[PDB]
Design a binder for this molecule. Structure first.
Ligand SMILES: Cc1c(C(=O)Nc2ccc(S(C)(=O)=O)cc2)cn(CCO)c1-c1ccccc1C(F)(F)F
Ligand SMILES: Cc1c(C(=O)Nc2ccc(S(C)(=O)=O)cc2)cn(CCO)c1-c1ccccc1C(F)(F)F
Lengths: 189, 195
């Protein structure tokens, strides 16, 4: 009984710490607030898998739902193969945040597409400086890894839409709403 | 101890029922979501005063401030009771209430301006026009007169609550119901670098 509760409570501790991180990313809180929410929601499983596999690779050197956990452990091993930088994690994290959208599209697809492109360019630039042994190779791998991140979580998004709150919506809109200062509008001066 | 708790809990019951009402108003949920929130926030005391004074005039014919059927500070309540009496003077229609309510919702903004001042200014204008049209059909006893009164009444509604906005300032509930229908949660399209 106790196990599945704690992971849904750690999931919650982090989902609030993701918001705080995303809200410094350039041009995020400059998106529509509808979209901020949608983009964090849709990404979350891609985002978590990466983050978990990362802390595997960093903390216990890729040592520590076994159908489903096996994937993450497998990626954390890939991280050692690539000797992934932090830079490459934080960028690839952002990219995952922007890799899952609704088929409908977002409020401002135009704004979103610039942001994603902006970041995809950061990666491009960032691997004409940290490859191994040319740049184009490093790019092919980091990209294909981000893709396989979707495949890992491919069939487990419906199975989340169950577990998928009033918590985060508080912290996202928190800083953006702009609450003495009030200007009332009169019909006669 | 018990009194001031219940009014802050009736305030909360209504704050959620305002959201649901606003979200059918034409061109509201078409505003920025930042603005929906700001507009409901800033208006709330203008909005409540009108609504309370209205249920006075409708339910008990302007005798007691009918806070609810579950309930049939006097510096401040005196104002509302005073307005509810004005309502009888004008024999205010429901139409005139619901429109004037919307106008109050769009009558208080931050001096900074909203995310989409342009969008907001069209909305307000749109509704100010509804009034204008709506009192070239329900006056008494010419149209221009009825406008002067309903407008000056919406103004006095700001004066009534003039100094009590700080005292309100100085939640996670409504933010849930506003964004509720607007965010658009199987359907997911993941974006691949290689097909
Ligand atoms: C533990 C967990 C987490 C989690 O911790 N995620 C996380 C995301 C980002 C970061 S970051 C970028 O480094 O801040 C850190 C952590 C998300 N979920 C899914 C909940 O809907 C679960 C969960 C719940 C129930 C069963 C199974 C699992 C699990 F996903 F673990 F398999
Ligand atoms: C009761 C109340 C209400 C209230 O019920 N408002 C309301 C708004 C719209 C509608 S509608 C359009 O018809 O749905 C109905 C009702 C708002 N506040 C202010 C709270 O910040 C209080 C309150 C709390 C504490 C002390 C004093 C008061 C009071 F305002 F009453 F003086």
């Amino acid at each position: 009984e106790n196990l599945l509760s704690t992971l849904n409570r750690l999931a919650g501790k982090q989902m609030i710490q993701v918001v705080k991180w995303a809200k410094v990313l350039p041009g995020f809180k400059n998106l529509p607030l509808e979209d901020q929410i949608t983009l964090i929601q849709y990404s979350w499983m891609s985002l978590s898998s990466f983050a978990l596999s990362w802390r595997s690779y960093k903390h216990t050197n890729s040592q520590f739902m076994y159908e489903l956990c096996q994937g993450m452990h497998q990626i954390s091993l890939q991280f050692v193969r690539l000797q992934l930088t932090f830079e490459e994690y934080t960028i690839m994290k952002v990219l995952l945040l922007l890799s899952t959208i609704p088929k409908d599209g977002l409020k401002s697809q135009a704004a979103f597409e610039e942001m994603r492109t902006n970041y995809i360019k950061e990666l491009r630039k960032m691997v004409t400086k940290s490859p191994n042994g040319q740049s184009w190779q490093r790019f092919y791998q980091l990209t294909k890894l981000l893709d396989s991140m979707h495949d890992l979580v491919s069939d487990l998004l419906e199975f989340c839409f169950y577990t998928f709150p009033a918590m985060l919506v508080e912290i996202i809109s928190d800083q953006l709403p702009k609450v003495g200062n009030a200007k009332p509008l009169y019909f006669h001066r």
